[PDB]
């Protein structure tokens, strides 16, 4: 008998859609062929990066006594990190603002 | 009449409920997270495609994606993304 469907995401233990990632890899004109483990590996990487950014933004929101993550929290989380700020240095986040930063020589005394 | 517009909103939200069960997320933060996911996806996929073309390979494998990740993600981002992806691929192969 036909087995009940079990998503490749669940097989890998991921939240992100391994099947959708594989579809995008096939449709994106990246290569003639796409190995079976490539969308799994990529979905895991995307899940890791998304989880990291969301967790830093949630920490920033908790420190600001806000329940819901906002673009300000995302910007704070991304810019407050050397590696994320190197990854997304060229990126602009809408309504993210800027880090509070005043040069020492401008401050009085 | 309307048509389906796929997005990563549900997956971002389901990852959020793991990293911070009680914390919510605004719609604009969802949009920014969608843009981030798409951008990183295109970066890694393009780098893997270029690696395959450089090696004359026609297929993109987990080794291609791993090399793209190590090239793009700086510092410990590369190490931890490699570890996460390797764990996921190993679990997928075992199951």
């Amino acid at each position: 008998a036909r087995a009940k469907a079990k998503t490749r995401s669940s097989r890998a233990g991921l939240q992100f859609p391994v099947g959708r990632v594989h579809r995008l890899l096939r449709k994106g004109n990246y290569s003639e062929r796409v190995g079976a483990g490539a969308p799994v590996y990529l979905a895991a990487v995307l899940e890791y990066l998304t989880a990291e950014i969301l967790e830093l933004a949630g920490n920033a929101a908790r420190d600001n006594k806000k329940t819901r993550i906002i673009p300000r929290h995302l910007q704070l989380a991304i810019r407050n990190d050397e590696e994320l700020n190197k990854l997304l240095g060229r990126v602009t986040i809408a309504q993210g603002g800027v880090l509070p930063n005043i040069q020492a020589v401008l401050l009085p005394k | 009449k309307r048509s389906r517009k796929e997005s990563y909103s549900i997956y971002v939200y389901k990852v959020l409920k793991q990293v911070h069960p009680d914390t919510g997320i605004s719609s604009k933060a969802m949009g920014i997270m969608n843009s981030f996911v798409n951008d990183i996806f295109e970066r890694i996929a393009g780098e893997a495609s270029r690696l395959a073309h450089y090696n004359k390979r026609s297929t993109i494998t987990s080794r291609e994606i791993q090399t793209a990740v190590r090239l793009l993600l700086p510092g410990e981002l590369a190490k931890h993304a490699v570890s996460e992806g390797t764990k996921a691929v190993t679990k997928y192969t075992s199951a």
Partner: single-chain antibody, 227 residues
Framework: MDIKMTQSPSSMHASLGERVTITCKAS??????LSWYQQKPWKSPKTLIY???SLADGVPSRFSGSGSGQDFSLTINNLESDDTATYYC?????????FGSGTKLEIKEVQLQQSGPELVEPGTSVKMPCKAS????????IQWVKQTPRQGLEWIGY????????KYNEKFKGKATLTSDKSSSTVYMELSSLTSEDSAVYYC?????????????WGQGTSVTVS
Amino acid sequence: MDIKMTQSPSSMHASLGERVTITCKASQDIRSYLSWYQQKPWKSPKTLIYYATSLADGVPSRFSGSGSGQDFSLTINNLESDDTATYYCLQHGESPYTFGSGTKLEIKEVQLQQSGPELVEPGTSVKMPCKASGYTFTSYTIQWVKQTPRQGLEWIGYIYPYNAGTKYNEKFKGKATLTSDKSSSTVYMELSSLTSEDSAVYYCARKSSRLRSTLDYWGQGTSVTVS
């Protein structure tokens, strides 16, 4: 409110080649952000397991961590004479990082240059330098850890040289204040109003800004003695 870590086995005795398992209990869920360390006496602690399951760089597969949530465990499969040391769990999921009480086990190039022992009199101040080499100084936080022979390991606080941001343990506000010098790759901890209680060995510890990253490389430790 600080998360209590409860290493149930205070000490074990074992022979060569047989398995030894050490466990930890948390007071609150830390979501796998727990590490295991090996400290041989009068040496700096070395990390073995990070993220509660992953092996550290260059540590053999003999060490196997397991668990999640509040219950965690450490396994050593093939014991050797060298394995006689003290093992500490470390949670870093919540802001005050907490080390375990430590389990004693008896069996029958990143550099952090830290200053030597400093004798000091009470009420004055002492400033301990950290000279970081072999890596991108700004990309990693420097974690400072205090080790008494009576209260075990205590996490003091950290500085992020990338943006000079600091976070302190509430037990050490005012007592400790951290500064950084990018031009010399040097991080300074100063202790104010030294007291006999402050007699302890202080370790600097590199830790990446990544949340799952642990305190991986440790300075040799500066012993501060208050008369």
